[model samples]
Target: RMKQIEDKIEEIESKQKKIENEIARIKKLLQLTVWGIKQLQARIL
Candidate 1:
């Protein structure tokens, strides 16, 4: 039972890392989009 619990914890940690990576990628894209908007605004102004 203890080994089973340890295995499950490891699996959950792996999944969490995957999710964190995906979120970080998405955040980076969002930042780029925001920067693009700012550049456009600067050109317009």
Candidate 2:
């Protein structure tokens, strides 16, 4: 029973790592998108 609990905890930790990585990637993309919009506005103004 203890081993099963440990396995489950490890599995959850792995999933959490993946989710953290994805969040980092999306944050970078969002920054790029915002920069692009700002550049466009600067050109128009």
Candidate 3:
């Protein structure tokens, strides 16, 4: 059970970073700051 929990947490963090990168790319394309994206990413992480 402990191992499973650790795996899940790692998986979630990986997914969150992927999402944040994607959002940051789109925001940069639009010439926008990604400040809020990181905060929201923290919320998800």
Candidate 4:
């Protein structure tokens, strides 16, 4: 039972790490998209 609990905890931790990485990736993409919009607006002006 103790071993099972430890394994579950590790699994949860692995999933948490993956989710954090995905969030970081999304933030970078959003920054790029915003920068693109700014460039487009400047060109229009």
lDDT score, candidate 1 = 1.00
Report the lDDT of model 1 for residue 28: 100
For model 4, name the residue pairs that clash. none
Error of 2 at 19 (Å): 0.5
Where's the lowest-lDDT run of ten residues in candidate 1? Answer: 1-10
lDDT of 3 at 25: 88
TM-score of 3: 0.61
TM-score of model 2 relative to the true fold? 0.93
In model 1, which runs have C-alpha deviations exceeding 4 angstroms?
none
lDDT of 2 at 7: 100
TM-scores of all predicted structures:
0.75, 0.93, 0.61, 0.90
* Residue-level error in angstroms, candidate 4, position 27: 0.5
Candidate 3 — what's its lDDT?
A: 0.88
Q: How much is the lDDT of residue 38 in candidate 3?
A: 69
Evaluated against the true structure, the overall lDDT of model 2 is: 1.00
Instruction: Give the number of the best model, judged by TM-score.
Output: 2
Clashing pairs in 1: none
